[PDB]
Symmetry: D2
Subunit: 150 residues, 4 copies
Amino acid sequence: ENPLFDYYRNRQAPLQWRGALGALAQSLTNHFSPEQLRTLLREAGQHFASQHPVQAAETVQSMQDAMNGVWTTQDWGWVDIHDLDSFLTLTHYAAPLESAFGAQNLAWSAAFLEGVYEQWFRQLGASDALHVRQSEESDVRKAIVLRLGR
Amino acid sequence: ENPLFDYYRNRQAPLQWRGALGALAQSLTNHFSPEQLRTLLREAGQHFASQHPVQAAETVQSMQDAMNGVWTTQDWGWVDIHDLDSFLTLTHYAAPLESAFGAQNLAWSAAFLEGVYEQWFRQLGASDALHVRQSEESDVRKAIVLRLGR
Amino acid sequence: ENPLFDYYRNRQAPLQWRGALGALAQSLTNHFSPEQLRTLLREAGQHFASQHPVQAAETVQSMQDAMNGVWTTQDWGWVDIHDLDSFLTLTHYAAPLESAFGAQNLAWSAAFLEGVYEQWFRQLGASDALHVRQSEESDVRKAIVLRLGR
Amino acid sequence: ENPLFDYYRNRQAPLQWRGALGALAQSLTNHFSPEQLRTLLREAGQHFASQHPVQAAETVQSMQDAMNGVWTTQDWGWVDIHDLDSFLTLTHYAAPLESAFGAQNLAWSAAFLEGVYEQWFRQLGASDALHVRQSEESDVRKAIVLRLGR
């Protein structure tokens, strides 16, 4: 139940990189504030999305399928998109960020995802007035909730 | 020969983290200079060595055995230590840094190792006057050469 | 909830070996019956336990600590041992067998664990009259329950 | 040179599965003869190729590109195809079979590849008279050489 979920969350990253990435996160936290780390990881996510473009889509389900197709080739969870009235809500499950950088660093590591979807939307013809922002409403460990809005 | 060695070097990191770490390295290079990145990675290596202490050793071969025992549990290559007159030369093989952060970033990513061994020496009674420095003399891709000297 | 647990269970094995091990399991199922596969995987578990011996223990908690210390170096879940009257019950969590060989093959792949603990008990002075057997009472996906009894 | 190549070959498989697959290979060798293991792994390769079909191609370079595109998503080396007169010679580099099942088992584990390309050619309209056979002429460790012939 709780212990099994904790083990799955903590061991999602491989043995080769868990300690190294934890040490890197520790050094980053020592040198920089959480906001600077959020900016850094957002730019990293933009670069990642640039290196892994999504196929052209027209509908919400097609965009979700393209994003999940990109994700499934690297074992990075999956995204569900819901069109609530005018705004799109993106829920990402099984992001391996917690296993690598630690749970307490999810306050900034999650910004990486915020950097990806944004750029992906820029590749799908989304208006520049729209931006992706992380909503601090639900538990970050369970899922990461983002909103594409003005 | 060359292509097989290149493939082995480029694919040492798993598919789950290669793109993410490449994007993170790209963002880090965009924001900070190589010297600041070297300082950051050295502190990261110090934290990594603190989190994974080495068993007490007395001889050079025992120190090598302890360091290799720590390395082999995470698939991070191996170290050979030679005692030339007064100074110790450490040659590290098969560091997965190139596969993760890219070959062109080895100018600073290798500093991570410089941060590890240093702390490990501090754990084995090495005098504070001695420090570990990377010698820019050989090919970085083949092996990483470090000197423990004054 | 259910989808997240399913994703964690299915993606525990790396991308490098998931398809290859699934194909190997398919070929094994086509060629051999479940009982023969159980015997084969039990012998495989015995060999694995021989290659990775456990440190000598005296109490139940120390035995569990040694077994978990062996497991944690390879990301293979963890074991809880309970001494019910005269028999030991071992519950194993987060075995990556399902991610590799598929859920429907857990009827025989779990025998691998039955082969490991047995040998480990033989290394800790357990009487030859005692054997490890898998109890088909609970859900195999949630946890694997084994009994060390006569 | 030699130690680096040996380390890269022996550590291609992750820490999570190296010991388990070695134990499984030991059990398979104890129970079955090499020819039976070759048949089993050939059928496994056919199933793997069925699960991961290649895109339709017309030329030799296009077929090689499709096969390498399938391989590169799972970190399984790469293949080079040469058209010598009437027969196709396939050289596969960086197969992780040796890291998993051991070098001494490459006498049969390589049959897995023999099972894949065969089925792949069956998907590309190759005549049923043509079969893929492993040529025992070169060093298995360096590369795996296969011939598609009558």
